[PDB]
């Protein structure tokens, strides 16, 4: 009876379950994509989705693009600095969402460089005709196996530009979704602090 009630009511209990870090088979990447697409669908008003690319309107520049899978893409014996999971552009702002890999010796190759960020911004300007003046990229780092409540609220704040009350109204369970960063990993806490405290690289 209780599981029947759970499935009936909590339509994204799977997203909550994967966000909490319970899923050891695939992690939370797919559920994160589904959550982000869900918010994109409720933030836009004419949304067309495809395999790896979801777009809203042609004027608002509301695009989600799941580039690849960082965990499998990252080989441990190669030297490349740019490997990102999702790329979301909202109006004139661009964000790169990367799930920090559990390997501290690969997190550094996972975080893209400043000049690569500049190139991404320049390509975005070329393709979508947005002037170089108001193109600005934010790099976003996330925990490897779960999400923090702070992480989710920040993801909503910068990727979708919706406040805390707006977020809790839009999704009921975020209000009491209580998760903290595991203190056993200080490397991720510091790296995420730095990356999220960075400013918008604007060119």
């Amino acid at each position: 009876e209780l599981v029947a009630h759970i499935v009936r009511n909590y339509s994204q209990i799977d997203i909550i379950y994967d966000f909490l870090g319970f899923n050891y088979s695939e992690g939370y990447r797919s559920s994160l994509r589904r959550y982000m697409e869900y918010l994109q669908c409720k933030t836009a008003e004419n949304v067309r989705a495809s395999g790896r690319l979801v777009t809203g309107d042609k004027g608002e520049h509301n695009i989600l693009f799941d580039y690849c899978v960082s965990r499998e893409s990252l080989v441990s014996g190669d030297s490349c600095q740019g490997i990102i999971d999702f790329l979301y552009i909202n109006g004139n702002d661009v964000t790169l969402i990367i799930i920090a890999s559990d390997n501290p010796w690969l997190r550094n190759r996972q975080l893209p460089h400043r000049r690569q960020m500049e190139g991404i911004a320049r390509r975005v300007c070329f393709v979508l005709g947005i002037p170089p003046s108001e193109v600005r990229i934010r790099n976003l780092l996330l925990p490897p196996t779960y999400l923090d409540k702070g992480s989710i609220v920040r993801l909503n704040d910068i990727v979708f530009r919706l406040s805390n009350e707006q977020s809790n109204l839009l999704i009921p369970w975020l209000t009491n979704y209580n998760k903290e960063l595991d203190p056993k990993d200080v490397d991720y806490t510091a790296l995420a602090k730095t990356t999220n405290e960075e400013e918008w690289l604007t060119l």
Partner: peptide
């Protein structure tokens, strides 16, 4: 309460639709 109340209150599969989903017409065949 919000979840409970939000749970309470709230084509043709022919040949042509398949062909047009695929982006081809019978004439081009």
């Amino acid at each position: 309460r919000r979840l409970e109340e939000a749970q309470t209150s709230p084509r043709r599969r022919t040949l042509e639709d398949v062909l047009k989903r695929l982006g081809k017409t019978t004439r081009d065949l």
